[PDB]
Write a protein that binds this ligand. Structure first.
Ligand SMILES: Nc1ncnc2c1ncn2[C@@H]1O[C@H](COP(=O)(O)OP(=O)(O)CP(=O)(O)O)[C@@H](O)[C@H]1O
Length: 171
C-alpha cells in the first residue's frame, strides 16, 4: 500500500466521473419532466423487458441538475434490478410512481421505485460507495429525505422533497 497513490487514483476517477456528469448536464440544460426523464433513462430496459417497468405520476417539470441526478439514479437502479432484483427473473416487475402531496399546507414531491414479484432479497444486502453516492447526489439536488428499504419482497426507494422553484420550475 501507498496512501499518496490511493488518493491520486480516487481524484482521477472522481475527475473522470465529473467529466461524464458535465456531458449530461450540458445535454440537459432545459430540464425535463419526471415522465420524459423516466421514459428516456429506462428506454434500453423497456426494449429487453417489455411490460415489466411501469411509470405513473403527474406532469411535473424538474431542473437540469435533478434531471441529470434522477437519470443516473433510474439507470443505476434498473442496472441492479437486472443483476439482483425484479428484472433478474421472468415474473418480477418495477413500479415507479410519483405525486404532489400535502402536509396540511406544505406541498411535497413524493417518488417511489418499487420492485415486486422478484427473487428474495437476502438479508446482508448493503450498498457500496457508488449507489450510496448517487442516492446522496439525488437527495441533495432534490433537498429530499431519501429512504432505501431492502425488503425481502423487493427493493423499495422513497423520496420526499419540499417543492421549491429552483428544483421544480414554475412552482
Ligand atoms: N434491486 C435489487 N434487488 C435486490 N438486491 C439488490 C438490488 N440492488 C442491489 N442489491 C444488493 O445490494 C448489494 C450492493 O449493491 P451495490 O450495487 O450497491 O454495490 P456493489 O459495490 O456491492 C456491486 P456493483 O457496484 O458491481 O453493482 C448487491 O450485491 C445486492 O445484493
Amino acid at each position: 500500500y501507498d496512501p499518496e497513490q490511493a488518493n491520486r487514483l480516487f481524484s482521477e476517477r472522481l475527475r473522470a466521473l465529473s467529466q461524464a456528469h458535465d456531458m449530461l448536464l450540458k445535454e440537459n440544460w432545459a430540464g425535463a419532466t419526471i415522465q420524459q426523464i423516466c421514459a428516456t433513462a429506462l428506454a434500453p430496459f423497456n426494449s429487453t423487458f417489455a411490460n415489466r417497468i411501469h411509470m405513473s405520476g403527474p406532469h411535473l417539470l424538474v431542473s437540469d441538475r435533478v434531471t441529470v441526478a434522477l437519470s443516473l439514479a433510474f439507470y443505476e437502479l434498473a442496472t441492479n434490478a437486472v443483476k439482483y432484483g425484479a428484472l433478474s427473473n421472468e415474473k418480477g416487475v418495477i413500479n415507479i410512481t410519483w405525486a404532489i402531496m400535502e402536509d396540511k399546507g406544505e406541498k411535497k414531491f413524493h417518488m417511489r421505485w418499487a420492485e415486486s414479484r422478484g427473487p428474495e432479497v437476502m438479508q446482508p444486502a448493503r450498498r457500496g460507495f457508488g449507489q450510496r453516492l448517487l442516492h446522496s447526489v439525488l437527495a441533495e439536488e432534490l433537498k429530499a429525505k431519501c429512504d432505501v428499504e431492502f425488503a425481502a419482497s423487493g427493493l423499495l426507494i422513497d423520496v420526499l422533497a419540499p417543492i421549491t422553484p429552483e428544483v421544480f420550475p414554475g412552482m
